Amino acid sequence: RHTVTMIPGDGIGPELMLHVKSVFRHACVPVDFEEVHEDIRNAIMAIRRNRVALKGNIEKSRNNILRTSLDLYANVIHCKSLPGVVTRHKDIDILIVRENSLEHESVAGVVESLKIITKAKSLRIAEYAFKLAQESGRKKVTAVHKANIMKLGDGLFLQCCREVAARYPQITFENMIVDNTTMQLVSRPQQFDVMVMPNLYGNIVNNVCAGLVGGPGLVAGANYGHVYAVFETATRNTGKSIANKNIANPTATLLASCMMLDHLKLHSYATSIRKAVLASMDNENMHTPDIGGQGTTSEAIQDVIRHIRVINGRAVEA
Amino acid sequence: VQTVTLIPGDGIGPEISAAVMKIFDAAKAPIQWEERNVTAIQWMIPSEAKESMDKNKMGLKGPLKTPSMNLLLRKTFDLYANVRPCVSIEGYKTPYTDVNIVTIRENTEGEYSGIEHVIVDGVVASIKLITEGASKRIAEFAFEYARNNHRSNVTAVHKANIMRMSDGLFLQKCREVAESCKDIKFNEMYLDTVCLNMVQDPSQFDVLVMPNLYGDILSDLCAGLIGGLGVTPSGNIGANGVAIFESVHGTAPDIAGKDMANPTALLLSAVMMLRHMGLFDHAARIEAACFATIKDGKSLTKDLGGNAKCSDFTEEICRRVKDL
């Protein structure tokens, strides 16, 4: 039995964590959640006890203090089509990896901003993307960059991806200008597999992809360090307007908790829950307002539980 | 009759430039073309091209090979506003059918400096520039474009929560200009929300104004929504009334001399050019003829993608525009 930190977070965060607990309790998942909320440095000490956290969304910045104190250098989001949510594009399956401001006024009216690229962090993220591509049987990593305009900085990032690619010759290495990438994403997003990029483009690409599979409410993410992993939804919106109205979409949180389960090597539980949420999402009556449905999160969770077959304390294939 | 500097450009440039000149003839557009070559010399642009453009004020540019020759034109004429109207095309189905967006991109500053430093070994800093003047100028342009093109709505795209000083400044100048033109409805939206909303429902957007790096990416995202650079018009507005309208697709060397090329992007850039110089009635006729031709689908060239030669596609447009 693994102990996993749970950060309820703000807005829809707490009501979704209750739904996660309920699903886990029904699935008989051998995980115990210890809830955690200067006080925040003491909260971080508590979080540091367990190597895995599942957290709702929040809000010098708490979410960034979190990733600093746990040294979570890799952000990963998983954009995958759900067949029951029909969008303009089908059969997308993308892992977006990216590394987790410096301005001044020179003379009046003139602002300068500095973007930092380092060899050390580029190599670390590239290794992460290639290890990830290998561990999960993915065939390709695409480095996304703007090296044509920013020759030294995105050039250095690209060069580090190339060094790492050389140690994974069995993984196709592709590199693509960020502009062409967004063009390719809205016309043939099926070509993509693992994407790795510096922080700024990940903002654009994360939200393009999330939109391609149906919205951020469907998309799970995680932050990884060498020892700690934190599992969350892809976007950091807390849903404060849509809170306690039984209207938040549970899909991304459930899918985050499945990719937390696989990380804990509870594959049979993760597969069972995940197939249950995908099968529930075939019924348009289980869709919540943000993806265009008229269902409530309660109905959706109840349907997910109905699709999880549990026999003698353990989740099974339907 | 108005003289327009025509830069054929490389590859299919001469071919699609011929098609546009033919179509404009059939439409009896009051346009005469001063053809100029612009291949860079010494680093400068030829005397004979620079004089025409300073005098003619209007320029139409085919695709160029790869200092960049486009970079010289931008520095030379101070082309500070990059304008891209993106409109879904009937008969050229993409999964996005109600896109009607104009992106307006600040085109002089940002990270196109090329300013970059090795701080210590293994650590690079790239430098992005934003100025009060350029931000004011691009915002004034976006509102004027709105007024002259019957656009209701300008959206400023930014990350002013993250980059308080640089994007905050750009945002502050858009707002100041918006106070002087309540004519046009103004709102502002985070880059990330724009990207999401762009793929989920691009029909909500009207005119988008943005700094250089965002515009470079969103103007290509929008072009992707409607079918690619082969059907996207594009304009660069500069100082002293000069405006260069351009293909942004490649030279397509693989097919350069085979009557196969697609002149739509250039043609709609030319239509953009007519509208910029007040010739709306001719722009409307020429645009209708081209859309009617794509909707019919009998004469589509290979990339749109029919089984037809540039010639036949061009001939059909000439046919249809002679009937008004």
Numbering used by the authors:
A (entry chain B): 15 to 51, 59 to 80, 90 to 130, 137 to 354
B (entry chain A): 4 to 45, 51 to 74, 81 to 338
List passages from the publication reporting this PDB structure.
Crystals of the apo αMγ belong to space group C2, and the asymmetry unit contains one αMγ heterodimer, which forms an (αMγ)2 heterotetramer with a crystallographic 2-fold axis-related heterodimer. However, in the αMγ structure, the γ large domain exhibits an approximate 8° outward rotation from the α-γ interface compared to that in the αMγCIT structure, resulting in an “open” conformation of the allosteric site. Crystal packing analyses show that in the αMγ structure, the γ large domain is involved in close contacts (<4 Å) with the α large domain of a symmetry-related heterodimer and thus its conformation appears to be constrained by the crystal packing; whereas, in the αMγCIT, αMgγ, and αMgγMg+CIT structures (which all adopt the same space group), the γ large domain is not involved in crystal packing and thus its conformation is not constrained. Nevertheless, we cannot exclude the possibility that the conformational flexibility of the γ large domain may play a role in the proper function and catalytic reaction of the αγ heterodimer and the holoenzyme. In the apo αMγ structure, the β3G-α3G and β5G-β6G loops at the allosteric site are partially disordered, whereas in the αMγCIT structure, the β3G-α3G and β5G-β6G loops are well defined in the electron density map. A detailed structural analysis shows that in the αMγ and αMγCIT structures, the hydrogen-bonding networks at the αγ-αγ interface are different from that in the αMgγ structure but similar to that in the αMgγMg+CIT structure. Specifically, the α-Q139A mutation makes Ala139A1 unable to form hydrogen bonds with His131A1 and Ala139A2, and similarly, Ala139A2 cannot form hydrogen bonds with His131A2 and Ala139A1. As a result, the sidechain of His131A1 points toward the α-γ interface and forms a hydrogen bond with the sidechain of His140G2, and the sidechain of His140G1 forms hydrogen bonds with Glu148G1 and Glu148G2; and similarly, the sidechain of His131A2 and His140G2 makes equivalent hydrogen bonds. The His131A-His140G interactions render the β5-β6 loops to adopt active conformations, which lead the sidechains of Tyr126A and Tyr135G to adopt the active conformations as well. In this study, we found that the αMγ heterodimer is constitutively active regardless of the absence and presence of activators.
